[PDB]
Copies of this chain bind each other. A is one copy, B any other.
């Protein structure tokens, strides 16, 4: 039967593209500008001058999601404000404009909210908010720690696993599948390996224009697929199961964990994992648990429980990676 999806209609790319955001706002109604914490306020303020629209700027933690009376919602910052804007957008049925400030994740253009253990927004229904436009100011994005930008490559790497898991789940459990969305996800995976050596450093914006487009493409894949399955499988379960067991997320980064998870899940899938390490090193991502200061026993506890995080999502983890099996995996792949 009939599939339908949305794509960001307008995408502005380049240095000081933040200046151009008025081009993509209709000259109509009031504008909620959701922002991050804490250094994203310059930009969110920066924006508000350029618009003849009256626009209130609430930080994501202070947003009254049910409060109507806004005709458009911008979101600016990282994952948190962007999700929050998506939720606002969905509840009120209003256009959403994404203005990412960092590229470490693939939600940038996904209509879906990030995975949440407590299910922060389950109350609001099946949220689907494909941004009507994306302002990708490469200068803002660029001048960010090289850690968090090289990690965004790491996130791309996991798409080889996520597609496999999703295919498996389709064949074993009948989960809805889209051949195209999977190809689209791998298009973005194939970009990350083909331009691996090329952009590892990030001296120029030309390097992150490739990154961010590739992440944006993953977002649209999820949109076609109907969920994050094309871009997030066992390798992200690994990440999610770690970052739930750290005190502060501050002491660990998603895209590294994803990249580490990818090495592990490649081994479990019985595909070439040696190579994915070879790319990970070349990018400068940690290819060892110790290198990421991840405790051996923390990994084993995550690995052996990750199949329970998302019970309606089947991966190569199947029923449970056993402890003894996870120990050995870490060894053969050399994380430990």
User: Taking beta carbons and an 8 Å cutoff, which residues of A are in contact with B?
Assistant: 1-17, 19-20, 23-24, 132, 164, 167-168, 170-174, 178-180, 183-184, 186-188, 190-191, 194-195, 197-198, 210, 213-214, 217, 220, 224, 267-268, 270, 274, 314, 316-325, 328-329, 332
**A170 → chain B closest CB, angstroms:** 8
- Collect the chain B residues with CB atoms within 8 Å of residue A322's CB: 172-174
**A185 → chain B closest CB, angstroms:** 10
Copies of this chain, count: 6
- Collect the chain B residues with CB atoms within 8 Å of residue A14's CB: 1-3
**A186 → chain B closest CB, angstroms:** 8
A187 and B194 contact, CB distance less than 8 A: no
Docked complex Cα distance between A24 and B323 (Å) = 36
Q: A213-B224, A332-B198 are in contact. Are A270 and B168 (CB under 8 A)?
A: yes
B174 and A184 contact, CB distance less than 8 A: no
B8 and A23 contact, CB distance less than 8 A: no
Docked complex Cα distance between A23 and B6 (Å) = 12
B172 and A268 contact, CB distance less than 8 A: yes
**Majority DSSP secondary structure for residues of A touching B:** helix
> Looking across the interface, which residue of chain B has its beta carbon closest to that of A197?
B274
A20 and B7 contact, CB distance less than 8 A: no
- Collect the chain B residues with CB atoms within 8 Å of residue A325's CB: 170-174
Contact of A214 among B1, B7, B180 (CB under 8 A): B180
Docked complex Cα distance between A12 and B7 (Å) = 11
- Collect the chain B residues with CB atoms within 8 Å of residue A17's CB: 2, 4
Docked complex Cα distance between A323 and B173 (Å) = 8
> Looking across the interface, which residue of chain B has its beta carbon closest to that of A7?
B7
Centre residue among A2, A6, A224 by max chain B CB count within 10 A = A2
> Looking across the interface, which residue of chain B has its beta carbon closest to that of A274?
B197
Docked complex Cα distance between A273 and B332 (Å) = 26
B179 and A183 contact, CB distance less than 8 A: no
Contact of A11 among B4, B214, B316 (CB under 8 A): B4
A-B contacts besides A5-B11, A168-B270, A173-B322, 19 pairs, CB < 8 Å: A2-B12, A2-B15, A2-B17, A4-B10, A4-B20, A6-B10, A7-B8, A11-B224, A170-B325, A172-B268, A174-B325, A179-B213, A183-B190, A183-B191, A184-B184, A184-B187, A184-B217, A187-B187, A319-B319
Contact of A20 among B2, B190, B323 (CB under 8 A): B2
Docked complex Cα distance between A218 and B180 (Å) = 10
A187 and B179 contact, CB distance less than 8 A: yes
16 examples of A-B residue contacts, CB within 8 angstroms:
A2-B13, A5-B10, A7-B9, A164-B270, A168-B270, A171-B329, A172-B320, A173-B322, A174-B328, A179-B190, A179-B213, A180-B210, A184-B217, A197-B274, A220-B224, A318-B318
A1 and B15 contact, CB distance less than 8 A: yes
Docked complex Cα distance between A168 and B317 (Å) = 10
- Collect the chain B residues with CB atoms within 8 Å of residue A274's CB: 197
A324 and B270 contact, CB distance less than 8 A: no
Centre residue among A11, A15, A183 by max chain B CB count within 10 A = A183
Docked complex Cα distance between A164 and B316 (Å) = 13
